[PDB]
Symmetry: C3
Subunit: 493 residues, 3 copies
């Protein structure tokens, strides 16, 4: 009779990392007969289309449900009214009355008052979505947003033409919620639930009320909070029986901080660990780190569930070294190019395939040019099928300075590909057996890493032996049955 609620601010088709885990964690719990659903706290006029696509693409399980604060009230409003809000559509159409249309593109058209030449409206049609912008004294003041010719949301714009206020509409066109938006930072202020004629300080206020309405105050109701920003939404509920857990997915220490600083959102979760049921960390290393620095004891280690897909038909014999990750400073791809340069000198043959995109994509691209490794290092860009990429690698390398567990390397080892990576906080140390299933390089030692890639990339015997021992290892440690038992013990306690 247990029921899990996993919290994250939003869900999207592009969005990854944490969501991927949550999606899979939901499959496992649903398989274990504990419905584990996702709760989001954002507005999306097309959430149905997003979820429908996520499930079609097989990223999200068919069983997994997504609860959303704004949809919750939208349903109350849908049930409350019976005829369409004809007066709203009449208001919109009346505004566009004695006007002349000046087409700019296909969908794009502008509307000017025939009697005065005043600029009235801008309209942009686009398959299913239509946008109507209303002007006043030559400045856009409003934006009516339609999906399938039915309005779902209206926005008011300030002097700097920036959203200062939102209004969401139900399936009949009636307004159910409105809210002030800080134009500068985009922060959500006073939220007005027009359907219930109730005011809320901020969105947090609203979601706290919502979670109290959604989740039954039973010891059987479990709240796992993945998204660290969503933590106080959970933490602030009046629930006295329902269980509250928080999951830390990243190394809690502020990245590139010799001062010993902590990540704001994470620090807050860790600090309150005794005030809730528990704080879940992925590695046992992180658990001890937290217990040492903080005067709190409700910290627990529960690894991510691991998807044990079938290993490729055959090993890669060619000297191809791979890496699949987001292009961000924490991943230190800058160091990867420095190792790549050291490797290609001692052996010209070996090629490096770097999949991914982000901020540092440009810096790394220019870095290859200067180091003259254009014929060896190839930035293969974004990938949608990363499992198919793994088939083509002899070994996977990771320069990452900061990690939570490094599931990416774990996922590589299942595909019988050995990992040569820097021993960092946190993860590699747990699953990489140095000189057995891959190489656990001492941090920053680019010369040692270069030597070990050359060793492994040249011997086809080692690459196959270390790769097979890598999969055998993950299967042993990361047993899905046991990780589930770990959770159950924690819930039933």
């Amino acid at each position: 009779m247990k029921k899990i609620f996993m919290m994250v601010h939003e869900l999207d088709v592009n969005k990854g990392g944490m969501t991927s885990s949550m999606f899979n964690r939901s499959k496992e719990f649903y398989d274990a007969d504990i419905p584990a659903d996702i709760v989001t706290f954002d507005y999306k006029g097309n959430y149905d289309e997003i979820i429908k696509a996520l499930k079609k693409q097989g990223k999200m399980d068919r069983r997994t449900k997504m609860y959303n604060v704004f949809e919750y009230f939208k349903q109350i409003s849908n049930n409350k009214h019976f005829k369409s809000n004809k007066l709203l559509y009449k208001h919109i159409s009346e505004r566009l009355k004695n006007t002349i249309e000046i087409e700019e593109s296909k969908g794009i058209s502008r509307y000017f008052d025939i009697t005065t030449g005043t600029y009235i409206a801008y309209i942009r049609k686009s398959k299913s979505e239509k946008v109507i912008d209303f002007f006043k004294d030559n400045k856009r003041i409003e934006r009516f947003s339609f999906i399938d010719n039915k309005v779902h949301m209206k926005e008011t714009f300030n002097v700097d033409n920036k959203v200062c206020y939102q209004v969401f509409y139900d399936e009949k066109g009636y307004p159910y919620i409105s809210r002030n938006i800080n134009a500068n930072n985009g922060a959500v202020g006073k939220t007005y639930v027009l359907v219930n004629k109730k005011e809320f300080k901020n969105n947090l206020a609203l979601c706290v009320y919502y979670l109290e309405k959604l989740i039954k105050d039973s010891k059987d109701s479990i709240m796992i909070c993945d998204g660290p920003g969503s933590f106080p939404k959970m933490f602030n509920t009046n629930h006295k029986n329902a269980q509250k857990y928080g999951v830390i997915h990243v190394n809690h220490h502020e990245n590139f901080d010799d001062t010993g600083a902590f990540k704001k959102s994470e620090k807050y979760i860790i600090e309150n660990a005794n005030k809730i049921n528990g704080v879940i960390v992925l590695t046992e290393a992180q658990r001890l780190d937290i217990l040492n620095q903080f005067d709190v004891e409700n910290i627990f280690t529960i690894s991510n569930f691991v998807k044990i897909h079938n290993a490729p038909k055959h090993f890669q014999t060619e000297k191809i070294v791979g890496h699949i990750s987001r292009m961000v400073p924490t991943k230190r791809i800058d160091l990867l190019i420095e190792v790549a340069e050291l490797v290609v000198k001692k052996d010209n043959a070996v090629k490096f395939h770097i999949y991914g995109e982000g901020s540092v994509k440009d810096k790394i691209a220019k870095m290859i040019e200067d180091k003259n490794l254009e014929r060896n290092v190839f930035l293969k860009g974004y990938t949608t099928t990363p499992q198919k990429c793994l088939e083509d690698f002899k070994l996977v390398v990771s320069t990452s300075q900061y990690e939570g567990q490094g599931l990416s390397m774990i996922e590589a080892m299942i595909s019988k590909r050995p990992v040569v990576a820097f021993d960092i906080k946190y993860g590699p140390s747990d699953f990489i057996e140095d000189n057995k299933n891959g190489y656990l390089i001492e941090n920053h030692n680019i010369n040692d890493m270069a030597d070990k890639i050359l060793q492994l990339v040249n011997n086809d015997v080692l690459a196959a032996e270390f790769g097979s021992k890598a999969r055998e290892n993950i299967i042993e440690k990361y047993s899905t049955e046991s990780i589930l038992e770990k959770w159950l013990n924690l819930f039933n306690s």
Copy 2:
């Protein structure tokens, strides 16, 4: 048949100092059969309530009338219309038409358009006063202000939500005046007397016209201008027979200026003294100072009238030293703490009671902590009954660097309390007889002042003898009959 008009920009229940004098000066002239009324130049929707309270509290005489520029036209408008301005209240109510109410507090409620969710209005009810704020494109643009459910004033707000324009309404809701307000500084620009369909450059322009309409151009009409900011309102009238006098209530030299600078407003009055009937100064010291530095001769000394209330039943035998004044830099309470420290060392017994509030209240409070005089110096805060406080003092001390006359010390001497104060510009020198009725300490000599407080606070014989000689002195010099004769001589001349 003489009639006096005393000018000050505004009147209020909190307001003090000058107003107190004006109020009492009005009693004396009314007693002498010369009606002396107050003329104000500010908008207050509740002026009746203010005056009613001032007179109930006995601060303002029952006979004293208050003439006000905005009330003057309001009466013309009241007399001009016969039915209520129904169309205005209809306009306001129509704005609040198809709306939904979202209560925040008791009086506070918000109004949103049922068809569109637009934020329409904010309403805050509060016993007699109601406020309606109207919004446009999520920003407040207008504020209708009601008293007893009848609108009296409307305000328009700029982009930074600041008053840029006012409209006052009469007893029927009709507009009689409107005016532009500089949003930055709050300055009043173009004033439009809608009742008379007349435009005015500034408020000065308007009040000048008003004073010409109010005051008869007879030699029997006397204008005393107390408020220095109101001076040009008087000075600029076309009156050829009516008398124009200006009163300087403070030391005309810019405070804390070694350069020998003059106070803008005051300098202007002094400079024009020959162009008007006269400039009245409180002390004979100030009179000579002005005559020396300025090439003008219409300066006269006429002290403040003094209220000779009954002295307390008995003297204070306990070592309690007092001070009742506003907490401002000119009063130099910082020096008072330095004298208090010097005194408490030589005699632990003596306690200091400092009544009053202002800007330097915080600095002085922190100053007592550091000097460790918490058990001796007590900041008794604001007082409403200062005469009752005087009963509890053995002697009154004053560190004030700048004064106009120092009526506060005079008022203390009437209550048979000797004054130990710094000899400054202007006042003490006239009424304090050193080593006879109090101590006239050489300025900044905190060591001499400390020694004299100790002398007086210890000898109960001296404290009673000097205190009695203090009252005997004020009664002699500050004879109410003679001060009145001084004025009469000036008017009849």
Copy 3:
């Protein structure tokens, strides 16, 4: 069958220099039976009144026509409608409905809402033109501009009360064009031809379309572009047969630039000379300069036509030295005062008459005071009859550092007045024969110029001989028949 179109952004009664030339160039071509008309690209509600006046004053030839982009569409709109746009005038009058009028001056009146006291409108009547400003939340938002009580243009104002959008109306009050105005710089953005329901990126876009509609793509259609800013309006047309020429009227090198920089607008014309029919320069000196610095060869020298008016009845015998020019830095009037000082020392008699106005008028006025030449140097201000001024001069002096040809000095020589000027780029060298018809002073040599003015101003024989030889010379070189033949050769080629 040839037809010329001369381009300049605008035409006005005050405007001079280039326009004067264009006007005269049009007379000559009309006289030679080639209609040469002016094409402008600006809005003026009273263009008719301007042209009517230009032609009355005899500045513009009666035959010369002025084509204007905005008038072009206005005519299409005039022809399209049959009844007056009654609804617009109804809209304006309805806005001014229940209002009270507060007169400020004669034409100036303000309108306030009788029910609420709201500031509605500002109206300023002025003989033929009327202006109505509409306010909203106490701020002007719109300005209806009338000529003979018929509205021609409306303007929308931003938060800083600055024009952000224009709407022009036809002879019936109907809107035909509207356009966005960048409030900061005053730049014209998106132009909407409401009559044709067509959008245009910028004004350039619009005028390019217009020129294509106006000018027939025949080899007989000639486009001369005088105004350098109007160049791309011409340059960007799709015309494959019509001739495109550009005229440079000034020294193309950026003034006061030791770096060897070029004037943006001019550089662009010169750079594209091979892409068009030709680039016309006034002097042969400038032609070579351009051909040297730029890898282009379509540069041609065609002087300005010269108006050979009758020389005065008699020479000026008095020691009067003149100068008629705009007060700008390029003219270097600062140097003229330095020469004037050097001259008046060696001979007190000689007086300097400096006609003109501009920016440096103030600096030069203060410069005469310091140098103490008040009794010799007289700034005669702006002149409307410059030919009558020439009668009163013995000799004309020019300190100008930068010139295009210096027609002003040529015009002086026709009036038999010798020119003593600095040899600069470009012009003087062509028409001044040193020690024959005037003096061609080596640049900056103020001492040599001083000596030559003294020589000439003293000898009445020389002043008459050099002056007569000056006119004889201009007549020879600047033959109107030959300049016309030069153009014809270029067109017919």
